[PDB]
Design a protein around this ligand. Structure first.
Ligand SMILES: NC(=O)C1=CN([C@@H]2O[C@H](COP(=O)(O)OP(=O)(O)OC[C@H]3O[C@@H](n4cnc5c(N)ncnc54)[C@H](OP(=O)(O)O)[C@@H]3O)[C@@H](O)[C@H]2O)C=CC1
Ligand code: SF4
Ligand code: SF4
Ligand code: SF4
Ligand SMILES: [Zn+2]
Lengths: 176, 95, 144, 287, 156, 114, 208
């Protein structure tokens, strides 16, 4: 099973050698290439308009780093540090404290947006699906202080939308 | 839901407020500190407590494979409220 | 046949609303395929879906003037969209979002406050942490 | 004082030091080198600028992550300057453009601008209020620049008396005024005593005074080492540079020594001479 | 207010002229370079926005720095940066270059391009998708809309 | 034990190669300070060359001295070429403080330096 | 044992047994360990005198061709008088067989420079000189590849830490890029993940 190329010869039929001579002096196949390029000229462009139209995607995209909360309930994170244990550049920084109620909680839940690399390990690792990779990707920030997410930054980023995230998970919790 | 500092700023749900002996107030100049005005404490006590008259009861969090795993909690006091660590919502029994 | 293309191609401008309706969207950016009128929603924005064009130019949006008081007649941003139309518009789904828009949860914002970096109102980082080691207070009562 | 205002560990690049400096100006030259030394030291700098953010953008990557902070201001309003010096351990005044302008002549910038800022710094609780000034600023004539700086020294000594009036000589550096005036030229000849001093050890003396107290209260003056003849020095500039009215009268007139107030020697810092730094700065000639 | 109004429209003119084209030089070390060449792709066009890819550094307006910037790379980076004219902007693309990121605890690697060049537009992602990068370039153009340069020269 | 040599037999060949290396560097420095358009006089550069040679002067094993000759020869070739840039030659110097003396009292103020 | 467990072939195992015994017989001078793994790839563990004889033999001898050369590194192992391990990797052409030739060395002894017997060892050996530290005598050019020109210390060693000792930054004082001692911004919090209870009892070292 080997199919090799570049084992041929210019056969010395007079029509063959005068066709190679016509190719040398007349540029036939060059005009053939121009014809192919004009055939792609008279097509339509496969473009979009960016501020109006947006490109196709999938529900399993990894975006925003948003948190979630229970239906009429509490913060979904219970500070179990698994996202730090699988964060491959250690952008997850957790310092946890309980409160006087009895349920355990946090103090500090921070992400380096420099060090995030968008695996999916902190989605596949979170045992209650608290941290969820968001749907969108528009950060584009003019300063560098404004890419170090605090806990309440993540809460308002998860409460600016969640029905989006809920729709993505509700569509595709079966596969993963 | 949130408070107002004696210095004129806000607290979070965690009490991390400042004083006049701090320079992080002067790095908050001109840019409004984002802070969630909807806490996580008051979304539990407002909910009335579920009442199921079994002995060892179940919890998932409202749905299969969406929420927290199957945790079985107990109601074997006379009047105290058993509380799931995952749910954060109490239960009572009716014998 | 060339006069049948000019006769077909002039109707979508004459059916756009006239001439000064088409003046606005042509000076804005590009849109010339108007004619489906699927859905309007909050911030007054308009969502037009055609099926005759290819996959990528199904679903487009026309923004409005002063959606939150920023004079957005020109210079439209991303994340000026509501989240259910944000599900519809990236084509992660293929259902219109007016079939089931909301969730029955009372904690979700009504603004969808857009890209805020570069304003007098933007984000800063800080330490959500209480007192570190609780440094000692000298005796403020006057001894001696 | 509150924690995380105390120093921490060693020095440099998020090794956090104790000083917090509100630096007026700093978009210009000497303020830029001073921000540079405070970034190497590992402090926090608050720079206000009355300009486009592009200039503070090109001086932005000096500090570490989120160390230097930016704001905007004008020289008329009390509240904006109060917002500038809300919380600041030290504050320095470096301001003044060397020509009369379309809205601000030399009068009342050097007078009125230190007034309100020294007022709010006295009513703001700062130490080491360091105000630059020129050498030989007197009521003697020939420069509105010099007489306005004399009245400015008078006011900064008058209110807030623990204010470090600090006067260097005609400093020379990578964006010098008079060295560029020497190079880009073509003019007359007199003789006048003159001493220059290079900029980086001058601002080393400034950061020593701003990091170590007991040097407050009194005023300081920086003195260059050489102090020789003008015309031979300009010939030195041409001979290393390969080629054979207010500012020019300021360099024609005088540069005298003042043995009253101390300088580089008693503060404990070494000032480098003219020649090595002059070779370092005299680039950009032909070929 | 005739001079103020005509100088304001003049500033609008020159800012619109600068935010029109902005053809950069594409520096492009690692796989963010392939993502830049794929935002030269027919799905997302740079040349709808006056953005011509051209590695001529003397006539480059903005500079996208992307890839894993190394300590062996940095001096040639800043020597490229010096011979580039004073209207200049820096778009730091990619988790390697906008703060170190994944190779952050590593020798011979710059801890992000904050420590080398002044930075204007951070865009994160790995890879930052062509939609996100193009959103960042439109936000750069809106920064060019908000500049007030000639107003500052007027009331200076 | 059978220690294979690098280059030598005793300290004789080691001292021969290191005095050859110092001869080459001493006739090599003014070429670089003439070429790279540097900023430091010839006296200070030669003083730091002889300081770097006097720093490592407590070793008597000949293999170590031969491997230092190898390191110096690698940098001598990469400096007689322009394979190194201006940054590396300036990086040999220390004009970026580091101002702390080895005084006990200054280490007591700028603390935690035993 | 039958589902989802990777099987192995007896034929390859016994042929590599016979071939390892063959080579170890016909080179009595330089054979210390001849081992076969459970997945049939041959390993031969070697005294560092006969580098050139072993490689001239294994390039040739007409019943084991082995022209294909793969990597070479002296993978750092402490707790030995001879720390570093030069790991030659050899792959046949006519035979489809993989052998690993590990010879040993310490920090200050030259191996005999495989660049003459295989032309492919040039940049491999230059890199392993720059990154480990074993000098290679009678080699033409050893320079620095994959490092900065002022970055010495042979960083792949276990003595070299995770961060470097230099941190470059631009300063406008001397108007250029300079080097400083490192001052990181985050700790690289290190974990204790070597859990006890002996997951593989077949590899227990015998205690005293
Ligand atoms: N040899 C020398 O050069 C010596 C100089 N000095 C003094 O040191 C100071 C620093 O030097 P240098 O950098 O050359 O001077 P600058 O002109 O650069 O410093 C003034 C700063 O304030 C800004 N500014 C200009 N006009 C005003 C105004 N009306 N109100 C507020 N801010 C204004 C300047 O420009 P922008 O608006 O763009 O920010 C600049 O940022 C100067 O005051 C100088 O007189 C003292 C002794 C010797
Ligand atoms: S996706 Fe980001 S935060 Fe999550 S584990 Fe990966 S690098 Fe860490
Ligand atoms: S894995 Fe999930 S629940 Fe656990 S600490 Fe991380 S975010 Fe919280
Ligand atoms: S940030 Fe990601 S995509 Fe970009 S160069 Fe680094 S690894 Fe590649
Ligand atoms: Zn529960």
């Amino acid at each position: 099973t080997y199919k090799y190329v570049n084992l041929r010869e210019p056969s010395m039929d007079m029509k063959s050698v005068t066709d190679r001579a016509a190719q040398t002096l007349l540029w036939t196949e060059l005009i053939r290439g121009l014809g192919m390029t004009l055939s792609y000229l008279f097509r339509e462009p496969a473009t979009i308009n960016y501020p109006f139209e947006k490109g196709p995607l999938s529900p399993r995209f990894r975006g925003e780093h948003a948190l979630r909360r229970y239906p009429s309930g509490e913060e979904r994170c219970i500070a179990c540090k698994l996202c730090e244990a699988v964060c491959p550049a250690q952008a997850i920084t957790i310092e946890a404290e309980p409160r006087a109620d009895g349920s355990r909680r946090t103090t500090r839940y921070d992400i380096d947006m420099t060090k995030c690399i968008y695996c999916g390990f902190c989605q596949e690792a979170c045992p209650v699906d608290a941290i969820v990779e968001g749907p969108n990707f528009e950060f584009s920030t003019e300063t560098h202080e404004e890419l170090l997410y605090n806990k309440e930054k993540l809460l308002n980023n998860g409460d600016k939308w969640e029905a989006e995230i809920a729709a993505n998970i509700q569509a595709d919790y079966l596969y993963r | 839901g949130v408070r107002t500092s004696p210095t004129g700023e806000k607290v979070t749900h965690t009490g991390q407020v400042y004083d006049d002996e701090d320079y992080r107030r002067v790095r908050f100049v001109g840019r409004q500190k984002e802070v969630n005005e909807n806490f996580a404490i008051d979304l539990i006590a407002e909910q009335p407590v579920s009442q199921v008259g079994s002995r060892v009861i179940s919890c998932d969090g409202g749905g299969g494979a969406l929420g927290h795993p199957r945790v079985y909690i107990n109601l074997d006091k006379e009047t105290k409220t058993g509380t799931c660590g995952y749910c954060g919502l109490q239960f009572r029994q009716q014998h | 046949e060339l006069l049948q293309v000019l006769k077909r191609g002039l109707q979508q401008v004459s059916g756009h609303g006239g001439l000064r309706g088409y003046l606005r969207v042509l000076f804005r950016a590009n849109d010339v395929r108007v004619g489906t009128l699927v859905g309007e929603d909050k911030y007054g924005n308009k969502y037009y879906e055609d099926n005759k064009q290819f996959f990528g130019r199904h679903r487009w949006v026309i923004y409005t003037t002063e959606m939150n008081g920023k004079n957005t007649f020109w210079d439209v941003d991303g994340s000026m969209v509501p989240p259910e139309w944000h599900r519809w518009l990236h084509c992660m789904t293929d259902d219109p979002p007016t079939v089931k828009p909301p969730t029955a949860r009372k904690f979700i914002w009504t603004n969808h406050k857009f890209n805020l970096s570069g304003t007098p109102q933007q984000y800063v980082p800080y330490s959500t942490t209480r007192k570190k080691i609780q440094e000692w207070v000298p005796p403020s009562t006057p001894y001696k | 004082l509150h924690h995380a205002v105390i120093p921490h560990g060693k020095g440099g690049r998020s090794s956090v030091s104790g000083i917090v400096a509100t630096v007026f100006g700093a978009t210009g030259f000497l303020g830029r080198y001073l921000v540079n030394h405070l970034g190497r030291m590992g402090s926090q700098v608050i720079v206000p600028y009355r300009c486009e953010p592009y200039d503070t953008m090109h001086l932005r990557p000096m500090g570490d992550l989120g160390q230097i902070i930016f704001m905007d201001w004008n020289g008329r309003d009390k509240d904006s300057i109060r917002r500038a010096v809300e919380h600041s351990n030290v504050v320095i005044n470096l301001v003044g453009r060397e020509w009369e302008t379309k809205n601000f002549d030399f009068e009342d910038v050097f007078v009125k601008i230190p007034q309100a800022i020294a007022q709010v710094s006295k009513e703001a609780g700062v130490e080491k209020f360091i105000h630059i000034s020129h050498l030989n600023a007197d009521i003697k004539s020939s420069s509105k620049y010099l007489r306005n700086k004399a009245v400015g020294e008078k006011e900064v000594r008058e209110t807030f008396p623990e204010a470090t009036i600090i006067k260097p000589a005609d400093i020379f550096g990578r964006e010098d005024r008079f060295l560029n005036y020497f190079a880009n030229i073509r003019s007359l000849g007199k003789k006048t005593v003159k001493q220059p001093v290079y900029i980086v050890d001058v601002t080393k003396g400034i950061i020593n005074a701003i990091k170590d107290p007991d040097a407050r209260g009194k005023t300081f003056a920086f003195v260059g080492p050489n102090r020789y003849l003008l015309f031979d020095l300009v010939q030195y500039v041409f001979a290393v540079a390969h080629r054979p009215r207010d500012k020019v009268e300021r360099i024609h007139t005088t540069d005298r020594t003042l043995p009253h107030l101390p300088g580089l020697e008693d503060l404990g810092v070494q000032a480098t001479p003219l020649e090595l730094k002059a070779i370092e700065v005299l680039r950009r000639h032909r070929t | 207010s005739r001079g103020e109004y005509v100088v304001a429209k003049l500033d609008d003119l020159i800012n619109w002229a600068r935010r029109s084209s902005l053809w950069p030089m594409t520096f492009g070390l690692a796989c963010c370079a392939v993502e830049m060449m794929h935002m030269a792709a027919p799905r997302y066009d740079m040349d709808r926005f006056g953005v011509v890819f051209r590695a001529s550094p003397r006539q480059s307006d903005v500079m996208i720095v992307a890839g894993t910037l190394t300590n062996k790379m940095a001096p040639a980076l800043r020597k490229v940066y010096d011979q580039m004219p004073e209207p200049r902007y820096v778009v730091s693309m990619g988790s390697c270059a906008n703060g170190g990121g994944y190779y952050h605890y590593s020798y011979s690697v710059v801890r992000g391009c904050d420590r080398i060049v002044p930075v204007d537009i951070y865009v994160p992602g790995c890879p930052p998708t062509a939609e996100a990068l193009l959103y960042g370039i439109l936000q750069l153009q809106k920064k060019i809309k908000r500049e007030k340069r000639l107003r500052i020269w007027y009331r200076r | 034990t059978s220690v294979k040599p690098i280059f030598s037999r005793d300290m004789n060949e080691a001292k021969r190669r290191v005095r050859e290396l110092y001869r080459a560097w001493y006739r090599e420095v003014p070429n670089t300070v003439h070429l790279f358009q540097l900023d430091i006089s010839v006296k200070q550069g030669r003083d730091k060359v002889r300081e770097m040679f006097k720093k490592n002067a407590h070793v008597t094993d000949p293999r170590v001295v031969d491997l230092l000759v190898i390191k110096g020869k690698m940098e001598l070739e990469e400096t007689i070429n322009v394979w190194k840039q201006r940054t590396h030659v300036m990086r040999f110097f220390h004009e970026t403080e580091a101002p702390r003396p080895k005084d006990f009292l200054s280490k007591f103020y700028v603390g935690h330096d035993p | 044992t039958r589902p989802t467990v990777r099987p192995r072939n007896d034929v390859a195992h016994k042929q590599l047994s016979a071939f390892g015994e063959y080579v170890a017989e016909i080179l009595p001078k330089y054979v210390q360990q001849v081992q076969v793994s459970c997945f049939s790839e041959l390993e031969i563990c070697i005294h560092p005198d006969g580098v050139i004889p072993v490689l001239t033999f294994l390039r040739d001898h007409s019943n084991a061709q082995f022209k294909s050369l793969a990597d070479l590194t002296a993978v750092d192992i402490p707790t030995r008088q001879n720390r570093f391990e030069i790991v030659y990797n050899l792959l046949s052409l006519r035979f489809n067989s993989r052998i690993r030739v590990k010879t040993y060395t310490d920090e200050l002894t030259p191996v005999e420079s495989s660049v003459s017997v295989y032309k492919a060892a040039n940049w491999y050996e230059r890199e392993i000189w720059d990154m480990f530290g074993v000098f290679f005598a009678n080699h033409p050019d050893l320079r620095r590849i994959l490092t900065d020109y002022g970055f010495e210390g042979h960083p792949f060693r276990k003595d070299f830490p995770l961060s470097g000792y230099v941190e470059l930054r631009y300063d406008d004082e001397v108007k250029r890029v300079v080097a400083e001692p490192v001052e990181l911004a985050q700790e690289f919090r290190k974990f204790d993940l070597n859990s006890p209870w002996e997951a593989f009892p077949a590899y227990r070292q015998p205690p005293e």
